[PDB]
């Protein structure tokens, strides 16, 4: 596999996304790390599916609303950054206020 440190640390963020989606299935208001986990995974999966930077930014904003998270989580997240591997290479994904 020859997993570089950038690839190894991108697995602990995926482990949290399965817990975020599993808690969403039971009907729970996501916290700060859980909300950012499920927001960042859509950018990595979007880049894997071959989606453009414009599409993944707007798609990452339409994942969760204010009723899907706890009271005050939207106030402390005015921006969400993450780097994903696209067809052309590694590109930044800035989501200005997804809730």
């Amino acid at each position: 596999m020859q997993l570089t440190p950038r690839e190894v640390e991108k697995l602990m963020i995926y482990t949290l996304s399965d817990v975020a989606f599993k808690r969403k299935a039971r009907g729970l208001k996501l916290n700060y790390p859980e909300a950012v986990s499920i927001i960042t995974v859509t950018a990595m999966e979007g880049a894997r599916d071959g989606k453009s930077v414009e599409d993944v930014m707007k798609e990452a904003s339409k994942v969760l609303t204010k009723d899907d998270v706890m009271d005050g989580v939207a106030d402390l997240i005015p921006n969400v950054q993450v780097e994903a591997i696209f067809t052309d290479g590694s590109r930044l994904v800035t989501v200005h206020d997804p809730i």
Binding site: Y32, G72, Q81, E83
Partner: protein, 571 residues
């Protein structure tokens, strides 16, 4: 010209009269003073005040004043004269000045001990909070990873003892004998925090204590497992007088040698540090809190009891069986715990913190205490006591500064005063060491951005190192340049007694870390402790364990939902 405070707050941050909410709590802190002339605010960035011939200057670094680092206008939260907005200066790993930064040659009202030049590297002080790093007086040296969890919550100083995961260390903070002391002073070379080793204070002779003082111990430790006898304390105090160090006690909870009033007679009114003054961790059951009424005592507290929760009663009945290897089948072992799990003193402990009686806050890490929840559990108690007891007569009519300044003093300046390291670390004052913590008011008391130690960042929040910025996810805390190579040792301090320093422990033990001797441990009292100088009368019922302070029952109802926990943490 004139502009609204909304656009000013969005760039330069708050000022005089602005109140800041501390996360999801009900506490608001107002700025008492702004030490800057409006118009010449110093900030770094693309085409901003800090450039050649504007904020910087052509003069040399030797001109005492050129800073090594500057925090561009931040809200300080100090216990001496905090809640102020001012530019803080760093030079030689110490706080140079607190006021206004820039070039005095082209800017009016620049503080003399605060000038930006060619040697300064700025920090975005705006929209953030600055404070002195936390100190933990009850640390069982069970694991070295413990420091990473402590430093990940704003605790850059440790005080305690131990070898490793030995049952002896698991229950008592001791590094006994010169051999163990030297090995631990040398193992601490690979740690990114200040350390103060505590020796075993259980002896009838003067000699065994003298051997540990000259080896390099900041104080002594008297545990119930090693025998908290009247002679063990008398001899530990007698030696602490002639050595100028602090003794920490975990009194006999079995009431074997005597009662609580007999151990106070054995103290002979000599200054002493009392761990877990409530009683969960240890001490003469039931009336331990009674010790916090005398002035010589320096009361501290473990953090699993604070804040007082609804489910706190259940967890501590099983927790008590592992720390001091007590059996669940022996009647003398379980019947002994029935008294120590008293819930009336845990609620009293929480209000005594608000009244200003329990002068400081510790943990008792991996032995009935959590090291990575200290600053958090302080602010959690502050939210509960404001919501129940309301604003104090000393507290202002429109802000909660007095309570926060009283509560931050318990983890910053008071533990430093207790262990004789006030002059080194404790408060954000001029001439002191640069052991500071930075957090957003949104994440105050739980998750800091950076942790400056000796003017260099030791630990901080960091994203993907391969990314184009430091903010991209996964953002988990990692060791920085202040915790790498020889700079970790330079920026960290191995505290010892003057005897050890004079003998030459740094050379004999070969310590590349900074070595500062502790002092002013014995003459200090509760009046010298900041914002917690009260010595009230006490009356404790021994049957039902009810606590009455000045003829008034001290208690409070437990809370189910506390401030900042599942909303920020994951596990």
């Amino acid at each position: 010209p004139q502009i609204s405070r909304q656009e000013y707050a969005g760039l330069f941050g708050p000022t005089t009269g602005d109140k800041i909410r501390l996360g999801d709590t009900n506490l608001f802190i107002e700025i008492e003073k702004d030490l800057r002339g409006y118009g010449e605010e110093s900030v770094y960035g693309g085409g901003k005040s800090l450039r050649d011939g504007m904020g910087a200057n052509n003069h040399l670094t030797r001109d005492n004043g050129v800073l090594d680092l500057v925090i561009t206008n931040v809200t300080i939260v100090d216990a001496r004269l905090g809640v102020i907005k001012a530019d803080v200066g760093i030079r030689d790993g110490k706080i140079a000045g607190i006021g206004k930064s820039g070039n005095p040659g082209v800017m009016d009202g620049v503080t003399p001990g605060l000038v930006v030049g060619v040697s300064t590297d700025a920090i975005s002080g705006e929209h953030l909070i600055l404070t002195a790093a936390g100190i933990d007086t009850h640390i069982h040296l069970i694991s070295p990873q413990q420091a990473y969890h402590a430093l990940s919550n704003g605790v850059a100083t440790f005080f305690g003892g131990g070898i490793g995961p030995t049952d002896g260390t698991n229950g008592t903070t001791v590094t006994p004998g010169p051999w163990n002391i030297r090995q631990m002073l040398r193992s601490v070379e690979g740690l990114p925090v200040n350390v103060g080793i505590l020796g075993k204070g259980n002896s009838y002779g003067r000699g065994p204590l003298l051997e540990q003082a000259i080896a390099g111990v900041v104080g002594y430790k008297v545990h119930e497992d090693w025998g908290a006898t009247a002679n063990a304390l008398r001899h530990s105090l007698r030696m602490a007088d002639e050595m100028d160090i602090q003794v920490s006690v975990h009194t006999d909870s079995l009431n074997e040698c005597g009662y609580v009033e007999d151990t106070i007679d054995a103290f002979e009114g000599r200054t002493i540090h009392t761990f877990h003054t409530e009683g969960a961790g240890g001490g003469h059951a039931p009336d331990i809190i009674r010790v916090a009424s005398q002035p010589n005592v320096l009361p501290s507290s473990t953090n699993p009891t604070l804040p007082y929760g609804v489910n706190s009663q259940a967890e501590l009945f099983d927790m008590i069986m592992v720390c001091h290897n007590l059996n669940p089948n022996v009647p003398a072992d379980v019947s002994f715990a029935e008294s120590r799990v008293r819930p009336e003193t845990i609620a009293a402990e929480n209000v005594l913190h608000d009244m200003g009686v329990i002068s400081m806050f510790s943990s008792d890490s991996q032995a009935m205490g959590r090291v990575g929840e200290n600053w958090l559990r302080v602010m959690q108690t502050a939210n509960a006591m404001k919501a129940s007891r309301g604003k104090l007569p000393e507290d202002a009519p429109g802000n909660d500064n007095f309570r926060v300044l009283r509560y931050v003093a318990k983890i910053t300046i008071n533990p430093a005063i207790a262990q004789g390291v006030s002059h080194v670390i404790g408060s954000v004052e001029v001439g002191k060491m640069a052991d500071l913590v930075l957090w957003d008011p949104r994440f105050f008391g739980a998750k800091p951005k950076m942790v400056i130690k000796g003017g260099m960042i030791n630990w901080a929040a960091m994203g993907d190192p391969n990314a184009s910025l430091p903010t991209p996810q996964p953002v988990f805390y990692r060791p920085m340049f202040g915790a790498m190579g020889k700079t970790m040792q330079d920026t960290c301090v191995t505290f010892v007694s003057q005897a050890a320093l004079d003998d030459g422990v740094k050379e004999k033990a070969g310590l590349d870390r900074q070595v500062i001797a502790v002092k002013n441990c014995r003459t200090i009292s509760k009046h010298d402790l900041v914002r917690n100088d009260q010595t009230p009368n006490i009356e404790v019922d021994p049957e039902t364990f009810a606590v009455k302070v000045d003829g008034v029952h001290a208690t409070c109802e437990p809370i189910d939902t506390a401030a900042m926990n599942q909303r920020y943490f994951f596990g």
